[PDB]
Structure 1
Amino acid sequence: MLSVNEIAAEIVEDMLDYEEELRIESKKLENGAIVVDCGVNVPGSYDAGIMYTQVCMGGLADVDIVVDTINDVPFAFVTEYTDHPAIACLGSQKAGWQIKVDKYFAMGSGPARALALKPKKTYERIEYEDDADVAVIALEANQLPDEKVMEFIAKECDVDPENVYALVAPTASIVGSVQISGRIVETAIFKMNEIGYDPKLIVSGAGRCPISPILENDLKAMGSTNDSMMYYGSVFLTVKKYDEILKNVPSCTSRDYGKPFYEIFKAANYDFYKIDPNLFAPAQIAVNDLETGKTYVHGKLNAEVLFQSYQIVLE
């Protein structure tokens, strides 16, 4: 068996060996839980962003950054791949655990989900559950979780708080930008599942996505980070059997294509968990079908919308 929590805990302990270089900071709370600030009160870094993404994907993906251009404008890009897409993406990376503890709110991602079974239906669908005595969660939030929050997470994962780790970064941070663009393969897998395609049929995925510039606050960053995938994210996927419904994966087949993600988020009263899950999707995909040996291409890139979302100023 592969344990996404045990594998990710090893990555976190490596992060902790390089705190200063990565521009992150950890603290152990009164109950023993370790909270790793990756961008709330510290800058974080590109490498912290890569490692945060690797942790979100349960250690079952390769994630790197390459610098390239869009209409000659330079950007950093995530390039990533996985041969465990259901587990890495739906069983771990998906932000499927809404954290609310009194006034503390966070979007919860990562391996801890596979112990707490959040949401239960995902684990039924992908036929995975972790078995571990350590839990690693990734929280997207503008505040660090305290003892009571970590005690709750530990309890839900059936682990002692002394064996829980949380990575934390806000949407508007370099770790935020990198880890969200690092969901490019996940966007495809998630949309495929939403339209009814069995994620257990997905063999592998590889993706590329520009990393958003950091906008002025977390609400605006929610828009630009998501627009990276929705308007400029590319995925090559391999599946056991093709289904014609897969033409509906790309974002250009959605009723809301052309709207900046910020507008979608605003219409959901700035509540991520109130957004229709059907609205998450990659810009373009190529699907290699093992059964027929064909590769079906769907979608398109849209630099014009991306540059608007990125608040680009040309001369």
Structure 2
Amino acid sequence: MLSVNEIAAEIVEDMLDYEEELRIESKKLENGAIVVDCGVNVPGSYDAGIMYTQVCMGGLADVDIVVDTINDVPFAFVTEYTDHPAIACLGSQKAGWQIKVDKYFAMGSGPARALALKPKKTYERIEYEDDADVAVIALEANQLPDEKVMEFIAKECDVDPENVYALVAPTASIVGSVQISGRIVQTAIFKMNEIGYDPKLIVSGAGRCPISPILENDLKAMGSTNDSMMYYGSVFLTVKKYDEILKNVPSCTSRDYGKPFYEIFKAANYDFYKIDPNLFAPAQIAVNDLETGKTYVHGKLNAEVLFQSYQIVLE
């Protein structure tokens, strides 16, 4: 049995060893919980974004950045892979814990979800849960959580607060852009499960996605970071048994395709948890089926929409 919280805790300790280099800052609160700021009152960095992504994926994914071009324009890209896709993506990475503690609101991702069982149905579906006495959570938020928030997280995870760590970054920050593009494989796995495909059948997944420039506020950044995956995110997946249903994985099969994610976000009143989950999906996928030995390709890339989404200005 692997422990995503223990593996991720090792990465968080590495992050804390290099705080100044990574442009992050931590604080131990009055109950002993550790809050790591990766973007609210600090700049963060590409490497902090990679480490935050690795932590969200329970330490069970490789994540790196390579610079490449789209129609000759240079971007940083995330390239990543995992051989524990259900656990890394659904059991850890997905932001499946909505944190609401009086006026404090955050989207919660990462290994702590596998202790608190958030949501319970996910852990039934992937047949995984952790048992650790350390909890590691990743918060997408424009404010840092206080003692009361950390005490609530600790309680839900059945751990002491002194054994809770939270990484925190806002949507519009470099760590935000990196970690959200770092969910490229997770988008595919999540969309596959939403359409009824058993994620326990998925053997491995590898993905690439450009890293959104940082737009002027958290709301517009929600749009462009998500469009990175929807219009320009590519996944190679290996599965035990193919299902014709997987033709409906790519975003271009959605009635909302062509729309800026910012549009969809606005209609949900800027509440991420009011977005229809059936809308998150990768631009393109290739699915290697171990049963037939065939590889089925679905989807397409769309630089035109992406450059609109990224507020690119050409000469």
TM-score range for the pair, normalised by the shorter chain length = over 0.9
> Following the alignment from structure 2 to structure 1, what is the Cα–Cα distance between the partners of residues 263 and 180?
18
**Partner SS, residue 165 of structure 2:** strand
> Following the alignment from structure 1 to structure 2, what is the Cα–Cα distance between the partners of residues 239 and 255?
26
Deviations 1:217-237 (A, max 9, x none): 000000000000000000000
> Following the alignment from structure 1 to structure 2, what is the Cα–Cα distance between the partners of residues 300 and 64?
23
> Following the alignment from structure 1 to structure 2, what is the Cα–Cα distance between the partners of residues 42 and 249?
37
Deviation at 1:83, TM superposition (A): 0.1
What TM-score, normalized by structure 2, do the two folds share?
Answer: 1.00
Deviation at 1:274, TM superposition (A): 0.3
The two structures, once aligned, show a CA RMSD in angstroms of: 0.2
Deviations 1:166-224 (A, max 9, x none): 00000000000000000000000000000000000000000000000000000000000
Deviation at 1:267, TM superposition (A): 0.5
Deviation at 1:243, TM superposition (A): 0.1
**Partner SS, residue 292 of structure 1:** coil
**Partner SS, residue 193 of structure 2:** helix
Count of paired positions: 315
> Following the alignment from structure 1 to structure 2, what is the Cα–Cα distance between the partners of residues 141 and 72?
33
Deviation at 1:165, TM superposition (A): 0.1
The runs of at least 4 consecutive aligned structure 1 residues that moved more than 3 Å come to: none
**Partner SS, residue 298 of structure 2:** strand
Where does the alignment leave 5 or more consecutive residues of structure 2 unmatched?
none
Deviation at 1:43, TM superposition (A): 0.1
> Following the alignment from structure 1 to structure 2, what is the Cα–Cα distance between the partners of residues 264 and 119?
23
Deviations 1:25-64 (A, max 9, x none): 0000000000000000000000000000000000000000
Deviation at 1:2, TM superposition (A): 0.3
> Following the alignment from structure 1 to structure 2, what is the Cα–Cα distance between the partners of residues 83 and 138?
21
> Following the alignment from structure 2 to structure 1, what is the Cα–Cα distance between the partners of residues 276 and 128?
25
Deviation at 1:254, TM superposition (A): 0.4
> Following the alignment from structure 1 to structure 2, what is the Cα–Cα distance between the partners of residues 163 and 171?
26
Deviations 1:240-290 (A, max 9, x none): 000000000000000000000000000000000000000000000000000
> Following the alignment from structure 1 to structure 2, what is the Cα–Cα distance between the partners of residues 277 and 224?
18
Residue identity (%): 100
Deviation at 1:162, TM superposition (A): 0.4
> Following the alignment from structure 2 to structure 1, what is the Cα–Cα distance between the partners of residues 5 and 91?
11
What TM-score, normalized by structure 1, do the two folds share?
Answer: 1.00
Where does the alignment leave 5 or more consecutive residues of structure 1 unmatched?
none
